[PDB]
Structure 1
Amino acid sequence: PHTYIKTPTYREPVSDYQVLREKAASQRRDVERALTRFMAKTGETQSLFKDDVSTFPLIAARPFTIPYLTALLPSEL
């Protein structure tokens, strides 16, 4: 065969619903954890424990001037 054989096959795709659910879930969890740690580190922060910024940082609660606009309104429409 090596003398004269050229067979152009494709690439086996991933159809495993289990590992696709796991990949999408873990990527969403990791990007939302990275986003919330970045936003809690670069702003005012609270803490459930005394002087706890590295582990479980909370974004501090800021008051709105008009709170029904950020509560009731839909953001994806």
Structure 2
Amino acid sequence: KTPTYREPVSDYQVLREKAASQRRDVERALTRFMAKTGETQSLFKDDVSTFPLIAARPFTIPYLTALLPSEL
């Protein structure tokens, strides 16, 4: 009656790969969701499914969104 555990994956290569691919997938999902539910642009003629761009909106005060840090 000696207990056993699950196989732990302590490998730096596969941990870097997992964190990288999860970050890339969540940022791709976020940008496709935000480009689909708003005004969109396109590099190609009538191209919304592949490479959708969030449309450029003008700010009333652009230095506040440019120069200010968001994580501090």
State the TM bucket, normalised to the shorter chain: over 0.9
Runs of 4+ residues deviating >2 angstroms: 9-12
Task: Verify: 1:63 aligned to 2:67, yes or no.
Answer: no
The structure with the larger Rg is: 1
The answer for unaligned runs of 5 or more in structure 1 is 1-5
Q: Deviations over 1:34-60 (max 9, x none)?
A: 000000000000000000000000000
The answer for unaligned runs of 5 or more in structure 2 is none
Q: Percent of counterpart pairs with the same letter?
A: 100
Structure 2 CA distance, aligned partners of 1:48 and 1:15?
43
CA RMSD of aligned residues (A): 0.7
Q: Deviations over 1:21-45 (max 9, x none)?
A: 0000000000000000000000000
- Name the SS of the counterpart of 1:51 in structure 2: coil
